[PDB]
Amino acid sequence: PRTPVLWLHGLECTCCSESFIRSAHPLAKDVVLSMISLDYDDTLMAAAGHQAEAILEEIMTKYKGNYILAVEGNPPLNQDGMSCIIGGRPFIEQLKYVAKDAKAIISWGSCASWGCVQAAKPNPTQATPVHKVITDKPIIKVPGCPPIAEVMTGVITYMLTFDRIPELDRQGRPKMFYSQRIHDKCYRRPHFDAGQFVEEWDDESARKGFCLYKMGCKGPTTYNACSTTRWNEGTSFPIQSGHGCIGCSEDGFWDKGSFYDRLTGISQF
Amino acid sequence: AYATQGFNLDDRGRRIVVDPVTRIEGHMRCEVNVDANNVIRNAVSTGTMWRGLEVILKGRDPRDAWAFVERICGVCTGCHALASVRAVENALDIRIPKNAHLIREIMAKTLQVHDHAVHFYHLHALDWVDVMSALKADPKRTSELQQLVSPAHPLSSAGYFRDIQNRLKRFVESGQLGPFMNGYWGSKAYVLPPEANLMAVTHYLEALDLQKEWVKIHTIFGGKNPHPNYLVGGVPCAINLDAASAPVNMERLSFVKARIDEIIEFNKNVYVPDVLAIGTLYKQAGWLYGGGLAATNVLDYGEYPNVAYNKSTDQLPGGAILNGNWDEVFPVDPRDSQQVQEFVSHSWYKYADESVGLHPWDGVTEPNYVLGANTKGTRTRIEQIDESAKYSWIKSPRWRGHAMEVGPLSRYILAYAHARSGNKYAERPKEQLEYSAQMINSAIPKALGLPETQYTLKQLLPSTIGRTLARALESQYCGEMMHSDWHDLVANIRAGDTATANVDKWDPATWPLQAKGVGTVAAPRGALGHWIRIKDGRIENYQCVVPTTWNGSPRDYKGQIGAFEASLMNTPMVNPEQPVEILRTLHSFDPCLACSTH
Numbered sequence: 001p002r003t004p005v006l007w008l009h010g011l012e013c014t015c016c017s018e019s020f021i022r023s024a025h026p027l028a029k030d031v032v033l034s035m036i037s038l039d040y041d042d043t044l045m046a047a048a049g050h051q052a053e054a055i056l057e058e059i060m061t062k063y064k065g066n067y068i069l070a071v072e073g074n075p076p077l078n079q080d081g082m083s084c085i086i087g088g089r090p091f092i093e094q095l096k097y098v099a100k101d102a103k104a105i106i107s108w109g110s111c112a113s114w115g116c117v118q119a120a121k122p123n124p125t126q127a128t129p130v131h132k133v134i135t136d137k138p139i140i141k142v143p144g145c146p147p148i149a150e151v152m153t154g155v156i157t158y159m160l161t162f163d164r165i166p167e168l169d170r171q172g173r174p175k176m177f178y179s180q181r182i183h184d185k186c187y188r189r190p191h192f193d194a195g196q197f198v199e200e201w202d203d204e205s206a207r208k209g210f211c212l213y214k215m216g217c218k219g220p221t222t223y224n225a226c227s228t229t230r231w232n233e234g235t236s237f238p239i240q241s242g243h244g245c246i247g248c249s250e251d252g253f254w255d256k257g258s259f260y261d262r263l264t265g266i267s268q269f
Numbered sequence: 270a271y272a273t274q275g276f277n278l279d280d281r282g283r284r285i286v287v288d289p290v291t292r293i294e295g296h297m298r299c300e301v302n303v304d305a306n307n308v309i310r311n312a313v314s315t316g317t318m319w320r321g322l323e324v325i326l327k328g329r330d331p332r333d334a335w336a337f338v339e340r341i342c343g344v345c346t347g348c349h350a351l352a353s354v355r356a357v358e359n360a361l362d363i364r365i366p367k368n369a370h371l372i373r374e375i376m377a378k379t380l381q382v383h384d385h386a387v388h389f390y391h392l393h394a395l396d397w398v399d400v401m402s403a404l405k406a407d408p409k410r411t412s413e414l415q416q417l418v419s420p421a422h423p424l425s426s427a428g429y430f431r432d433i434q435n436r437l438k439r440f441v442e443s444g445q446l447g448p449f450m451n452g453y454w455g456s457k458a459y460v461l462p463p464e465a466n467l468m469a470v471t472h473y474l475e476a477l478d479l480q481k482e483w484v485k486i487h488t489i490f491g492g493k494n495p496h497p498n499y500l501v502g503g504v505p506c507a508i509n510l511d512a513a514s515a516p517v518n519m520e521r522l523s524f525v526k527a528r529i530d531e532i533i534e535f536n537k538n539v540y541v542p543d544v545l546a547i548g549t550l551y552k553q554a555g556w557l558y559g560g561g562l563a564a565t566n567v568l569d570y571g572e573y574p575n576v577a578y579n580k581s582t583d584q585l586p587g588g589a590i591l592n593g594n595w596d597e598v599f600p601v602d603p604r605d606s607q608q609v610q611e612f613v614s615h616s617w618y619k620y621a622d623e624s625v626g627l628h629p630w631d632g633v634t635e636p637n638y639v640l641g642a643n644t645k646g647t648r649t650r651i652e653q654i655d656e657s658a659k660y661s662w663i664k665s666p667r668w669r670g671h672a673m674e675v676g677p678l679s680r681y682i683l684a685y686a687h688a689r690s691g692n693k694y695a696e697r698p699k700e701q702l703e704y705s706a707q708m709i710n711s712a713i714p715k716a717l718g719l720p721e722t723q724y725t726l727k728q729l730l731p732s733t734i735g736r737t738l739a740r741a742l743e744s745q746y747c748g749e750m751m752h753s754d755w756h757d758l759v760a761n762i763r764a765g766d767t768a769t770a771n772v773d774k775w776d777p778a779t780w781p782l783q784a785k786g787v788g789t790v791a792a793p794r795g796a797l798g799h800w801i802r803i804k805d806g807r808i809e810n811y812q813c814v815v816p817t818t819w820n821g822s823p824r825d826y827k828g829q830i831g832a833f834e835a836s837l838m839n840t841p842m843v844n845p846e847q848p849v850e851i852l853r854t855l856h857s858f859d860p861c862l863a864c865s866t867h
């Protein structure tokens with residue numbers, strides 16, 4: 001018997017769902033067919049409307065305190081919650097109802113973890129991360145916009161193998177994936193250490209892969225696995241393809257100034 | 270009850286609610302009324318989400334905008350970033366270098382293929398394919414069907430289909446049906462034989478494994494997928510052949526070419542043949558519903574110029590068609606205040622004057638969540654939405670006041686029209702359509718022992734089948750085009766031009782103190798535009814009009830219906846309590862609700 005997963009969607013862009021299906025090790029196909037039972041998920045599920053709604057009740061009853069609630073996106077508190085409507089009711093009512101009997105709650109991505117783009121100033125919907133709404137349940141944050149595919153399936157794999165939540169840091173992120181800053185093992189680090197920087201896009205320095213700190217790279221303050229695990233079966237990551245890290249796994253990264261403004265106090269890094 | 274655009278709307282019949290609409294991106298509610306015979310006589314499209322990206326952008330740096338608006342959508346990932354950088358570049362008179370153009374085109378076409386193929390198999394197929402019927406299929410006959418549908422596809426053996434089938438059986442026999450749970454399996458709306466169902470589910474699984482390879486093109490040029498990085502002035506992926514130290518060298522380009530070649534094989538051998546075969550069988554069953562506005566009014570901005578910044582060389586040439594007159598394509602100008610306009614008369618927003626539509630340079634986004642007095646239920650518990658008042662988070666875009674359908678089908682009807690008027694750049698899509706019509710009318714029926722039909726493209730294309738076909742054909746065409754773009758990129762680099770970014774106007778001190786620009790993109794789901802006003806180096810106004818905004822729109826000031834609502838009209842339902850037909854037709858537009866509302 002495979003662990004039921006109820007994957008809800010609030011206000012979101014659906015990047016985390018797309019990232020999940022990019023996983024190569026393990027394949028999303030193998031996760032869905034052989035590891036979990038993905039019983040509710042608006043993206044992929046056959047049933048709609050009343051028939052979809054009926055699944056939630058059925059799984060919650062049969063697997064009370066033995067299903068995982070995965071949340072992509074977040075609930076809005078403005079517009080009486082009706083800036084995100086599910087079944088004619090505010091999303092926040094669905095979130096709270098399904099959270100009630102979950103064994104564990106996964107906050108997929110920056111939206112669920114922190115707020116992401118809709119929570120950037122002035123946050124017209126008062127979009128609010130899951131942990132500020134659901135306060136009486138264990139929540140694992142898997143931030144990033146989206147998180148790396150193998151980080152997402154890695155969290156699932158750990159939880160299914162051990163039936164435990166992995167060790168979390170102070171911010172509720174799994175240490176197995178979020179213990180390193182990008183800047184720790186970034187392959188451009190020798191250039192940083194030698195003061196070798198890009199100053200304008202496509203200058204000679206950019207063509208030699210010099211450090212992107214002066215182009216606004218937020219790797220020195222951003223915790224993720226991008227410099228080692230990398231993206232799409234280790235094909236590249238933002239810095240390898242020539243753009244600085246924009247800090248996308250960090251709380252409130254949209255409101256820490258322009259992405260192209262450099263960090264101050266370079267001597268701290 | 271009232272008449273509009275040749276549709277007789279009537280809300281006196283039985284009311285049916287579908288909320289949530291699943292197998293879409295984002296959040297939608299759909300309501301219909303059906304008559305005494307279960308035919309849809311009214312349809313109501315409600316976008317059930319809003320985030321307010323347009324509001325959030327105010328006061329920010331135009332150079333950062335692409336990253337914010339990219340997060341409008343992770344499904345059509347990057348198309349918003351492309352529109353944004355184009356808009357800012359247009360505002361600031363920035364011309365990007367040839368390599369940046371070509372790399373953006375390759376990225377755009379990669380998205381087209383990935384988006385289209387994943388949509389069809391993973392979101393749409395279950396409206397046509399009965400997975401339980403696939404369990405009853407005979408492996409040998411499935412193999413023989415596969416060989417008729419696509420001879421060149423290597424995965425055709427009886428044992429291969431037997432193994433796939435067995436894993437399905439074990440999955441279903443577990444009692445944990447997962448995404449197939451509570452499905453509409455066995456409904457008479459399903460017409461495929463067991464063997465076609467097994468073939469299709471097999472390709473669903475094949476596409477799921479392969480789709481992750483195609484996006485590695487994005488990863489090379491943009492660092493990651495979803496949400497690859499873009500840049501105002503060009504691309505960040507600097508080029509150095511002589512070299513492992515740069516983002517792009519010849520090895521990285523060879524890798525891209527290998528992925529492109531695989532894409533071409535998939536479109537040609539798996540995706541296009543499946544849609545032709547499934548379309549043929551549903552045509553044979555007489556299921557030609559869902560044409561909606563495609564039979565009259567279609568629009569696209571036009572895309573993929575052979576020569577950069579030269580719109581006459583667009584390989585998907587656009588414009589507007591009205592009244593089903595395919596002999597007259599009107600030019601569409603996104604800068605013209607009298608052309609693209611958005612109404613909010615039936616949307617949850619407010620204007621100073623709601624009897625008019627606003628061009629997006631003058632666009633306004635102030636939320637106004639209020640329900641009409643004939644609503645059944647409350648503000649936080651809606652039972653029946655009141656479509657006579659405001660009923661959606663989606664605005665109502667119109668072109669010179671006309672309601673238009675947008676998307677691959679629109680682009681293919683436009684391409685066909687252009688080709689007939691002597692436009693040579695539309696030759697390939699015309700060839701695809703004629704080839705497809707011959708396969709659907711004649712060749713596939715002959716192969717399967719079915720009677721031949723004689724539908725013209727005029728009769729066949731304006732339908733849910735036609736809309737699905739055009740998406741597949743567009744995927745094929747995009748794969749072909751980026752194959753050519755790749756060759757042009759490598760040729761340009763080898764000729765000595767390694768430039769990837771124009772930084773002349775990177776610094777805001779070089780900008781005019783006031784400016785406006787527009788960026789358009791033929792995004793996977795249709796016509797995308799971003800309109801920007803810049804003041805003192807900051808975003809004064811930023812308005813997006815997105816393809817699903819067009820298609821999913823509620824009624825305008827004149828009460829005219831949008832493409833979704835029109836497409837559901839005049840459609841019989843086998844069972845009013847099973848939304849099979851509603852889903853099939855709605856899904857044929859590939860709705861992206863996060864896109865529609867942003």
Ligand code: SF4
Pocket residue numbers: 182183184186187188189190192210211212213217218219220239244245
């Ligand atoms: S600042 Fe950025 S590019 Fe430079 S070494 Fe650190 S993470 Fe890498």
Ligand code: F3S
Pocket residue numbers: 144145182222223224226237238239244245246247248249493
């Ligand atoms: S922008 Fe995000 S994807 Fe990794 S390199 Fe930075 S945390």
Ligand SMILES: [Cl-]
Pocket residue numbers: 110114115116117119250251252253254
């Ligand atoms: Cl955030």
Ligand SMILES: [Cl-]
Pocket residue numbers: 218221247256263
């Ligand atoms: Cl920062």
Ligand SMILES: [Cl-]
Pocket residue numbers: 355365370373
């Ligand atoms: Cl461009």
Ligand SMILES: [Mg+2]
Pocket residue numbers: 323664812813814815867
């Ligand atoms: Mg808009």
Ligand code: NA
Pocket residue numbers: 202207506507508509767768769770
């Ligand atoms: Na370069």
